[PDB]
Design a binder for this molecule. Structure first.
Ligand SMILES: Nc1nc2c(ncn2[C@@H]2O[C@@H]3COP(=O)(O)O[C@H]4[C@@H](O)[C@H](n5cnc6c(N)ncnc65)O[C@@H]4COP(=O)(O)O[C@H]3[C@H]2O)c(=O)[nH]1
Ligand SMILES: [Zn+2]
Length: 360
C-alpha cells in the first residue's frame, strides 16, 4: 500500500471546523449541564470532567463522543480480586468520619453497581426537558460502565464514571508502561506520579459476575502519550522531524471501524474496539522507539507492521494491557477464538487486496 494512497485516505477523512465545533458545542452543553446537576448530590459533589481530549474519538460517524467523569475519592484502599491484576475492591483506609459514598457501602467494600445505578438514574432523570436540546438515553448495554446519550438524534456521547486515586499505582502496573527506551525513564517517572482512575466494571468469575469490582483506567496517560509521542521533543514540530505514528493509529482505527461497520449484522466484531488497536499500537511504539523508524515516507511500511503485529495478537491470542502486562485483552475468556479468526480473515483479505474497505 502506497504512502501517498494512505495519506489520501486520511486526507479525505478530514472534517470541516464547522461540524467539529457544532458537535463539540452540543456535547459541551449537555456535559456541563449534567455536571451542574450532578453536583446537587452530596455523593457526586466532587464530580468533574476528566481531561482525555473529549474530541476526535471517531475518524468518520464522527458524531460519537467519549467523555469521562472523574470523582475525587480520598484515602482508598484497593484489594486485588482473584489475581485478575486489573480488577479491585474499593475500601477506605480510615473511615471513622461519615463518607459521602457511605450510601453505596455494601459493608466494607464500595458497591460499583450501586454507584453506577445512581449515576445513571441521575443522568436519566435530568436529561429530560431541562435542555433546549433533545437528549435520550440509550439502552443499557450488558456489563458496560458507560452511560450513552443521544443528542439531537445524531450525536452519541459515552459518559464513564471514574473514581480518582492520587495514591501510587497498584503493584500490577510495576512492569507496565515500558516507555524507557522510547519516551525516557524520567517521563515514565513523572507520569507514574499522576493519579490513576477506576471504572465500575465487574470481572468474570466462571459463569458469574462480582459487580463489586472496579477496573484500572489510565486514559489520561494514553492521551498524554498520544499528544507527545516522539523520542525527540520537537517531533512533528517541523518538516525535518515529521513522523507517521498518528497516521498509523488513525489508519488502524479506521480499518477496524470500517470492518465493524461492514459486518454489523454479525456478532463477530462487537467485542473488538479501538482500544485494542491503540494498545497494539503502543506495543509497536515500544518495539520501534526511534523517530527514524516512523519516517513519513515509510507510512506504507510502518502501517503494514502495525497490521502484522495486530494480526499476531489475534493469532496468538495475546494482547497485554500496556499498563497492566499480566492483563490479557485477547484472552479466550474475553473474546472467543472464532471471532478473532474472523477478524483475522477480514484483515488478511484487506491487506492482500490493497484495502478495498478504504474506498468509501
Ligand atoms: N474513557 C474511558 N472509557 C471506558 C473505560 N472502560 C470502559 N469504558 C467505556 O465503556 C464502554 C464499554 O466498556 P467494556 O469494558 O464493558 O468493553 C470494552 C473493554 O472490554 C475493552 N476496553 C475498552 N477500553 C478499555 C480500557 N481502558 N481498559 C481495559 N479494557 C478496555 O473494549 C470494550 C469496548 O470498549 P469501547 O471503547 O468501545 O467503549 C467503552 C468505553 O466507552 C476507561 O477505562 N476509560
Ligand atoms: Zn511525531
Amino acid at each position: 500500500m502506497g504512502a501517498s494512497k494512505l495519506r489520501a485516505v486520511l486526507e479525505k477523512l478530514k472534517l470541516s471546523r464547522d461540524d467539529i465545533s457544532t458537535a463539540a458545542g452540543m456535547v459541551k452543553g449537555v456535559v456541563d449541564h449534567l455536571l451542574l446537576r450532578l453536583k446537587c448530590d452530596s455523593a457526586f459533589r466532587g464530580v468533574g470532567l476528566l481531561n482525555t481530549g473529549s474530541y476526535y474519538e471517531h475518524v468518520k460517524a464522527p458524531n460519537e463522543f467519549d467523555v469521562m467523569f472523574k470523582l475525587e475519592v480520598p484515602r482508598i484502599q484497593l484489594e486485588e480480586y482473584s489475581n485478575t491484576r486489573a480488577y479491585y475492591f474499593v475500601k477506605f483506609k480510615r473511615n471513622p468520619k461519615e463518607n459521602p459514598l457511605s450510601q453505596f457501602l455494601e459493608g466494607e467494600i464500595l458497591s460499583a453497581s450501586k454507584m453506577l445505578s445512581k449515576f445513571r438514574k441521575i443522568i436519566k432523570e435530568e436529561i429530560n426537558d431541562i435542555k433546549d436540546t433533545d437528549v435520550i438515553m440509550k439502552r443499557k448495554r450488558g456489563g458496560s460502565p458507560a452511560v450513552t446519550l443521544l443528542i439531537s438524534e445524531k450525536i452519541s456521547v459515552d459518559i464513564t464514571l471514574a473514581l480518582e486515586s492520587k495514591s501510587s499505582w497498584p503493584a500490577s502496573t510495576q512492569e507496565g508502561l515500558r516507555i524507557q527506551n522510547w519516551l525516557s525513564a524520567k517521563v515514565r517517572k513523572q507520569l507514574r506520579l499522576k493519579p490513576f482512575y477506576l471504572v465500575p466494571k465487574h470481572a468474570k468469575e466462571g459463569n458469574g459476575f462480582q459487580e463489586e469490582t472496579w477496573r484500572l483506567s489510565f486514559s489520561h496517560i494514553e492521551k498524554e502519550i498520544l499528544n507527545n509521542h516522539g523520542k525527540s521533543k520537537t517531533c512533528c514540530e517541523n518538516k525535518e522531524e515529521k513522523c507517521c505514528r498518528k497516521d498509523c493509529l488513525k489508519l488502524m482505527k479506521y480499518l477496524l471501524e470500517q470492518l465493524k461497520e461492514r459486518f454489523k449484522d454479525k456478532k463477530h466484531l462487537d467485542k473488538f474496539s479501538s482500544y485494542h488497536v491503540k494498545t497494539a499500537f503502543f506495543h509497536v511504539c515500544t518495539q520501534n522507539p526511534q523517530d527514524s523508524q516512523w519516517d513519513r515516507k515509510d507510512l506504507g511500511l510502518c502501517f503494514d507492521n502495525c497490521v502484522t503485529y495486530f494480526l499476531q495478537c489475534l493469532r496468538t491470542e495475546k494482547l497485554e494491557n500496556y499498563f497492566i502486562p499480566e492483563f490479557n485483552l485477547f484472552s479466550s475468556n474475553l473474546i472467543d477464538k472464532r471471532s478473532k479468526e474472523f477478524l483475522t480473515k477480514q484483515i488478511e483479505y484487506e491487506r492482500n487486496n490493497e484495502f478495498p474497505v478504504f474506498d468509501e
